[PDB]
Design a protein around this nucleic acid. Structure first.
Ligand SMILES: OC[C@H]1O[C@@](CO)(O[C@H]2O[C@H](CO)[C@@H](O)[C@H](O)[C@H]2O)[C@@H](O)[C@@H]1O
Ligand SMILES: OC[C@H]1O[C@@](CO)(O[C@H]2O[C@H](CO)[C@@H](O)[C@H](O)[C@H]2O)[C@@H](O)[C@@H]1O
Ligand SMILES: [Mg+2]
Length: 580
DNA sequence: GATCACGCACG
DNA sequence: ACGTACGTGATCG
């Protein structure tokens, strides 16, 4: 059963052909400044394993890596590219990435190794990485014989699988999505991750000290009000204090006991002074544990930068996610948490942070796809969309829209984008299912094109088996035919939501590609640092701000052409906090 | 130790 | 609600 290959002691010319499957193996999950443990090459001339110390010190091999005209097929080329950037080596000419190809074909498969991608096409002559390396405490790089055969079998699988994957992408009309959107984006994300974001660790440490003082104060107040010390971060110990010792009403249970979620606590606050203190404690504790201590653990002590990893092949809608650290959920909604952003600073002297965000991209995308006359007109007038929605559903003039009305119309707009249901809206607004249904009925009377879209997309999902986004991303929805109401309804909400969230994802990905090309043409030093779903965050010399104020919004607004305008707001300042 | 349950940060 | 990451404490095994 063994797979033949040359365990090479030196790089030869036949290893440097102009098309190859290439494996540059990085086993550590976080590949930043991580070891490359081995290299495999499969091409017309055979199969090869190279020790990294050998290949990466060889000038011909390094030149071949960096030659755009020598084409490589890979799995997770970003991982390799970034590990190589940390070694000062450029990887070019990646023409096929099996991880991104598998992801586009079916995001639900959760493909995260070559074996899983291969199994999609009945190819099983390669082991799962977890089988080779083990998992958790028992994870380890095996001896050279085992390692080499594994890397060669992965390269061989990539070599074999490129054509059937490209053929299927082409049938799905996704070949341009791979080659013109996701692959070029992978290189851009590699640059962003490698650059990292500078952190003002002294400021974080000072915030930490202040938080600890406040946590101490509130913690003691809680014990005082409870008449007893207990573990406040234990929903089970906390439940006993609240619902047994203090006799608060049980408005909601969980699988294993009493609910103490913030929405339940907010309702209990009027009964006892301890409740507001628990909420405050939770707010502070979240900032302290997750943000202060968490960021300080992953900042690089030499450069004081954090280097996130954007998972490009995870979400079911086509969004990125971000890990270790997650830089897409830094606090902003509450002022106390928002100050954490004062610790994210430019990487060079006399540079600034510049942030640009789409205004209501999801609702604008919905206006476009539904071709709803009223909603399109609203965005063509650049109206406040929540005030307009309130005017329509409550049948009042602009003058007559009260703050509570705008708040409830806003909630309907979110429900509409998420996939509307009377239960979901009733829970959000703390009203009855009947009252929620009335709001939804009035919404659909005012936006009949949106109503027709929502009916039609559920039917299309049933008929075709999947739904698609503007640039032809797809998501299969087999549960749409379930005879279980809850299972089927969740799938219907995915059918409604995915073309909106996913098309917004497509647009900003295209904007990033367009933006980097414009930045290069203009030879600006500005560069991307982060993407947070509908916003791009850059840093640049202060002398580039005026040019960015015109360039970045224009590129983001013109990335696609819709039946309504796209609108982009922007701000800049000395820290991420100030870019407001 | 690993995994689950719960809670909560973001768009 | 739709889409994510992850920290703490409880429980599985
Ligand atoms: O390199 C990112 C790429 O690798 C995968 C596995 O193929 O995820 C791995 O790397 C992530 C980043 O460090 C980890 O969060 C992770 O758990 C690990 O499996 C892909 O999912 C991802 O696209
Ligand atoms: O009454 C139709 C209305 O119900 C929805 C669910 O909100 O779809 C249901 O009705 C269908 C056919 O008309 C089925 O295909 C279906 O699976 C069922 O859930 C709406 O989509 C539809 O407009
Ligand atoms: Mg915005």
């Amino acid at each position: 059963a063994k797979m033949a290959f040359t365990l090479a002691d030196r790089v030869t010319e036949e290893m440097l052909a102009d098309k190859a499957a290439l494996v540059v193996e990085v086993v550590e999950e976080n590949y930043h400044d991580a070891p490359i443990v081995g290299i495999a090459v499969v091409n017309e001339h055979g199969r090869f394993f190279l020790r990294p110390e050998t290949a990466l010190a060889d000038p011909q091999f390094v030149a071949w890596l960096g030659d755009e005209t020598k084409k490589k097929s890979m799995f997770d080329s970003k991982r390799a590219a970034v590990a190589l950037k940390w070694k000062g080596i450029e990887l070019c000419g990646v023409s096929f990435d099996l991880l991104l190809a598998a992801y586009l074909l079916d995001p639900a498969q959760g493909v995260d190794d070559v074996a899983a991608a291969a199994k999609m096409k009945q190819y099983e002559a390669v082991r799962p990485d977890e089988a080779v390396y083990g998992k958790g405490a028992k994870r380890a790089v095996p001896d050279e014989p085992v390692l080499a055969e594994h890397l060669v079998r992965k390269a061989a699988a990539i070599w074999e699988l490129e054509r059937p994957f490209l053929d299927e992408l082409r049938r799905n009309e996704q070949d341009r999505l791979l080659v013109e959107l996701e692959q070029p984006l992978s290189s851009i994300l590699a640059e962003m991750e490698f650059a990292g974001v500078k952190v003002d660790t002294k400021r974080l440490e000072q915030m930490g000290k202040e938080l600890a003082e406040q946590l101490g104060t509130v913690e003691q107040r809680i014990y005082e009000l409870a008449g007893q010390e207990f573990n406040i971060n234990s929903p089970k110990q906390l439940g006993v204090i609240l619902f047994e010792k203090l006799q608060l009403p049980v408005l909601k249970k969980t699988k294993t006991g009493y609910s103490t979620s913030a929405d339940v606590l907010e309702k209990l606050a009027p009964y006892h002074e301890i409740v507001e203190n628990i909420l405050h404690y939770r707010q502070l504790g979240k900032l302290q544990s997750t943000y202060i201590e968490g960021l300080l653990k992953v900042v690089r002590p030499d450069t004081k930068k954090v280097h996130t990893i954007f998972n490009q092949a995870l979400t079911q809608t086509g969004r990125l996610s971000s890990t270790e650290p997650n830089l897409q959920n830094i606090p902003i909604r509450l002022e106390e948490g928002r100050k954490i952003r004062q610790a994210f600073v430019p990487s060079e002297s006399d540079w600034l942070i510049f942030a640009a965000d789409y205004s209501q991209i999801e609702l604008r995308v919905l206006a476009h796809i539904a071709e709803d006359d009223n909603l399109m007109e609203a965005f063509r007038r650049d109206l406040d969309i929540h005030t307009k929605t309130a005017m329509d559903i409550f049948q009042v003039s602009e003058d007559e829209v009260t703050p509570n009305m705008r708040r409830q119309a806003k909630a309907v707009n979110f429900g509409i984008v998420y996939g509307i249901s009377d239960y979901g809206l009733a829970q959000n607004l703390n009203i009855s299912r009947k009252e929620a249904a009335e709001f939804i009925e009035r919404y659909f009377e005012s936006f009949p094109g949106v109503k027709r879209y929502m009916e039609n997309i559920v039917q299309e999902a049933k008929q075709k088996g999947y739904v698609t986004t503007l640039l032809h991303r797809r998501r299969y929805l087999p549960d749409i035919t379930s005879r279980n109401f809850n299972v089927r309804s969740f799938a219907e909400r995915m059918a409604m939501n995915t073309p909106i969230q996913g098309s917004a994802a497509d647009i900003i990905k295209k904007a990033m590609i367009d933006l980097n090309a414009r930045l290069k043409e203009e030879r600006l030093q500005a560069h991307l640092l982060l993407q947070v779903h509908d916003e791009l965050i850059l840093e640049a010399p202060k002398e580039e701000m005026e040019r960015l104020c015109r360039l970045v919004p224009e590129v983001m607004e013109q990335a696609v052409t819709l039946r309504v305008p796209l609108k982009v707001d922007y701000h800049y300042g000395s820290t991420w906090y100030d870019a407001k």
